Design a protein around this ligand. Structure first.
Ligand code: RET
Length: 137
Protein backbone atom coordinates (compact mmCIF):
# COMPACT_ATOMS: atom_id res chain seq x y z
CA UNK A 1 0.00 0.00 0.00
CA UNK A 2 0.88 3.66 -0.22
CA UNK A 3 -1.30 6.04 1.79
CA UNK A 4 0.61 9.10 0.51
CA UNK A 5 -1.63 11.70 -1.05
CA UNK A 6 -3.69 14.83 -0.62
CA UNK A 7 -7.08 13.49 0.39
CA UNK A 8 -10.38 15.39 0.25
CA UNK A 9 -13.52 14.24 2.03
CA UNK A 10 -16.57 13.02 0.10
CA UNK A 11 -18.68 11.50 2.91
CA UNK A 12 -18.86 11.93 6.68
CA UNK A 13 -21.14 9.76 8.80
CA UNK A 14 -22.03 9.47 12.49
CA UNK A 15 -19.71 12.29 13.61
CA UNK A 16 -22.43 13.93 15.72
CA UNK A 17 -23.14 10.64 17.49
CA UNK A 18 -19.43 10.27 18.23
CA UNK A 19 -19.24 13.78 19.71
CA UNK A 20 -22.34 13.03 21.76
CA UNK A 21 -20.56 10.11 23.45
CA UNK A 22 -17.64 12.45 24.12
CA UNK A 23 -19.91 14.95 25.89
CA UNK A 24 -20.09 17.83 23.38
CA UNK A 25 -23.32 19.85 23.62
CA UNK A 26 -25.73 20.08 20.68
CA UNK A 27 -24.84 23.38 19.09
CA UNK A 28 -21.09 22.73 19.15
CA UNK A 29 -21.85 19.26 17.75
CA UNK A 30 -23.70 20.75 14.78
CA UNK A 31 -20.90 23.26 14.13
CA UNK A 32 -18.29 20.51 14.41
CA UNK A 33 -20.17 18.29 11.96
CA UNK A 34 -20.03 21.16 9.48
CA UNK A 35 -16.29 21.53 10.10
CA UNK A 36 -15.76 17.77 9.71
CA UNK A 37 -17.52 17.93 6.34
CA UNK A 38 -14.53 20.02 5.19
CA UNK A 39 -11.80 17.70 6.52
CA UNK A 40 -8.69 17.24 4.41
CA UNK A 41 -5.87 14.79 5.12
CA UNK A 42 -2.34 15.02 3.73
CA UNK A 43 -0.24 11.88 4.19
CA UNK A 44 3.43 11.22 3.52
CA UNK A 45 4.22 7.52 4.05
CA UNK A 46 7.84 6.33 4.09
CA UNK A 47 7.67 2.62 4.80
CA UNK A 48 6.07 2.28 8.24
CA UNK A 49 6.65 5.95 9.13
CA UNK A 50 3.72 8.33 8.59
CA UNK A 51 3.54 12.12 8.49
CA UNK A 52 -0.11 13.15 8.45
CA UNK A 53 -1.70 16.57 8.35
CA UNK A 54 -5.41 16.74 9.21
CA UNK A 55 -7.14 20.05 8.61
CA UNK A 56 -10.46 21.80 8.47
CA UNK A 57 -11.21 25.39 7.42
CA UNK A 58 -9.70 27.08 10.51
CA UNK A 59 -7.57 24.35 12.14
CA UNK A 60 -4.74 22.01 11.22
CA UNK A 61 -2.85 19.37 13.19
CA UNK A 62 0.26 17.32 12.40
CA UNK A 63 0.40 13.68 13.50
CA UNK A 64 3.69 11.83 12.97
CA UNK A 65 4.10 8.20 13.95
CA UNK A 66 5.84 4.94 13.21
CA UNK A 67 3.86 1.70 13.17
CA UNK A 68 4.44 -0.20 16.43
CA UNK A 69 5.98 2.74 18.34
CA UNK A 70 4.02 4.66 20.95
CA UNK A 71 3.46 8.36 20.34
CA UNK A 72 1.43 11.19 21.84
CA UNK A 73 -1.54 12.89 20.19
CA UNK A 74 -5.05 13.91 21.31
CA UNK A 75 -8.44 12.25 21.25
CA UNK A 76 -11.15 13.61 18.96
CA UNK A 77 -12.54 15.82 21.72
CA UNK A 78 -9.03 17.10 22.46
CA UNK A 79 -7.63 15.22 25.47
CA UNK A 80 -3.97 14.15 25.27
CA UNK A 81 -3.42 10.43 24.86
CA UNK A 82 -0.78 7.84 24.16
CA UNK A 83 -1.37 6.06 20.87
CA UNK A 84 -0.08 2.93 19.18
CA UNK A 85 -0.71 2.05 15.53
CA UNK A 86 -0.67 -1.50 14.16
CA UNK A 87 -1.44 -3.04 10.81
CA UNK A 88 -4.49 -5.25 10.62
CA UNK A 89 -4.05 -6.13 6.91
CA UNK A 90 -2.08 -5.00 3.88
CA UNK A 91 -4.07 -1.79 3.44
CA UNK A 92 -5.56 -1.04 6.89
CA UNK A 93 -4.14 0.18 10.20
CA UNK A 94 -5.69 0.55 13.66
CA UNK A 95 -4.72 2.95 16.43
CA UNK A 96 -5.47 2.37 20.11
CA UNK A 97 -5.49 5.39 22.42
CA UNK A 98 -5.12 5.53 26.19
CA UNK A 99 -5.75 8.75 28.10
CA UNK A 100 -2.79 10.41 29.81
CA UNK A 101 -5.04 11.69 32.62
CA UNK A 102 -8.47 10.86 33.98
CA UNK A 103 -10.95 8.55 32.30
CA UNK A 104 -13.30 8.58 29.35
CA UNK A 105 -14.77 6.41 26.61
CA UNK A 106 -12.45 3.98 24.88
CA UNK A 107 -11.24 5.74 21.73
CA UNK A 108 -9.45 4.53 18.61
CA UNK A 109 -9.13 5.24 14.92
CA UNK A 110 -8.47 3.29 11.72
CA UNK A 111 -7.19 4.15 8.27
CA UNK A 112 -7.81 2.01 5.18
CA UNK A 113 -6.84 2.29 1.51
CA UNK A 114 -9.50 0.59 -0.58
CA UNK A 115 -9.05 -1.17 -3.90
CA UNK A 116 -11.23 1.51 -5.56
CA UNK A 117 -8.76 4.26 -4.60
CA UNK A 118 -10.60 5.64 -1.56
CA UNK A 119 -9.23 6.39 1.89
CA UNK A 120 -11.57 5.32 4.70
CA UNK A 121 -10.99 6.74 8.17
CA UNK A 122 -12.98 5.67 11.17
CA UNK A 123 -13.01 7.13 14.64
CA UNK A 124 -14.55 5.22 17.52
CA UNK A 125 -15.75 6.01 21.04
CA UNK A 126 -17.24 2.96 22.81
CA UNK A 127 -19.94 1.54 20.50
CA UNK A 128 -20.14 4.58 18.19
CA UNK A 129 -18.11 4.51 14.97
CA UNK A 130 -17.73 7.57 12.74
CA UNK A 131 -16.77 6.85 9.13
CA UNK A 132 -15.08 9.42 6.85
CA UNK A 133 -14.42 8.64 3.17
CA UNK A 134 -11.87 10.53 1.06
CA UNK A 135 -10.57 10.64 -2.52
CA UNK A 136 -7.29 11.93 -3.88
CA UNK A 137 -7.38 15.60 -4.84
C1 RET B 1 -5.12 9.15 10.08
C2 RET B 1 -6.10 10.14 10.46
C3 RET B 1 -6.27 10.74 11.67
C4 RET B 1 -5.41 10.44 12.86
C5 RET B 1 -7.36 11.68 11.83
C6 RET B 1 -7.67 12.41 12.92
C7 RET B 1 -8.81 13.28 12.94
C8 RET B 1 -9.29 14.02 13.97
C9 RET B 1 -8.65 14.05 15.33
C10 RET B 1 -10.50 14.81 13.77
C11 RET B 1 -10.72 16.09 14.09
C12 RET B 1 -11.95 16.82 13.86
C13 RET B 1 -12.66 17.35 14.88
C14 RET B 1 -12.36 17.11 16.33
C15 RET B 1 -13.81 18.26 14.65
C16 RET B 1 -13.60 19.18 13.46
C17 RET B 1 -13.18 18.39 12.23
C18 RET B 1 -12.16 17.25 12.40
C19 RET B 1 -12.72 16.07 11.59
C20 RET B 1 -10.81 17.67 11.79
Amino acid sequence: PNFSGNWKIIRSENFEELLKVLGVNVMLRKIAVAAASKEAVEIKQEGDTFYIKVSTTVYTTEINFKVGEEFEEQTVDGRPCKSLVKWESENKMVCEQKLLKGEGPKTSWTKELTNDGELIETMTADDVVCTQVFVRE
